Amino acid sequence: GPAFEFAVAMMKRNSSTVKTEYGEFTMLGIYDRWAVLPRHAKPGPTILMNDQEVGVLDAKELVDKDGTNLELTLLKLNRNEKFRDIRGFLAKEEVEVNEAVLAINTSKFPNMYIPVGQVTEYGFLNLGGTPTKRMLMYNFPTCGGVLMSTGKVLGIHVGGNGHQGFSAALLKHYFN
């Protein structure tokens, strides 16, 4: 219940629906006009944010230092309003919890919340025939959804299959 209350509030304040030429995704603004998208969103020079066109001044396809894929794309946007800073909600390293909620805010899954239970650091994973690290795991039957628990933003949903879902851990240092 507390994780749900925290998630609804966090999504109202920092999330938006984004449309790229590759689909509709949930986007979470982090600080300034720096936001994060699942890598597969493949944002172009402009995106649509809540049905209105916005420019992208920069995009960084995050990688660890053995060059490995982390499956997240940081994007700097061209707009005036700034994101309520949520870096203090981001852990320093992969978080494991016993009760997490996955929140989605697009059109196929509008203001939807999924209880996914315990989340455990999964580590290395060959996601798309692509080597990937910093993966978090939870059971998830059947995006860019935001994985949260009470007072914590854990990661961004990037994949899964039938019974397990995977999120890229959203770490504090990716943002300074």
Would residue 163 show up in a list of annotated catalytic residues for this protein?
Answer: no
Residue spans of the domains in the chain: they are 1-14+84-176, 15-83
Sign of CA dihedral 140, 134, 72, 155: positive
Would residue 143 show up in a list of annotated catalytic residues for this protein?
Answer: yes
Question: What fold characterizes domain 15-83?
Answer: Thrombin, subunit H (2.40.10)
Structure-determination technique: X-ray
Would residue 40 show up in a list of annotated catalytic residues for this protein?
Answer: yes
Helix (H) or strand (E) holding 3: helix 2-14
- Asked, colleague to colleague, whether 1-14+84-176 and 15-83 share their fold, the answer is yes
Set 61, 99, 143, 173: catalytic member:
143
Per-residue three-class SS string for 44-102: CCEEEECCEEEEEEEEEEEECCCCCEEEEEEEEEECCCCECCCHHHECCCCCCEEEEEE
Do the Cβ atoms of 78 and 33 come closer than 8 Å? yes
What is the C-alpha separation between 94 and 91, in angstroms, rounded?
7
Considering the domain delimited by 1-14+84-176, tell me its CATH architecture: Beta Barrel (2.40)
What is the C-alpha separation between 123 and 132, in angstroms, rounded?
8
Set 24, 53, 71, 99: catalytic member:
71
Set 21, 24, 40, 173: catalytic member:
40
Do the Cβ atoms of 89 and 83 come closer than 8 Å? no
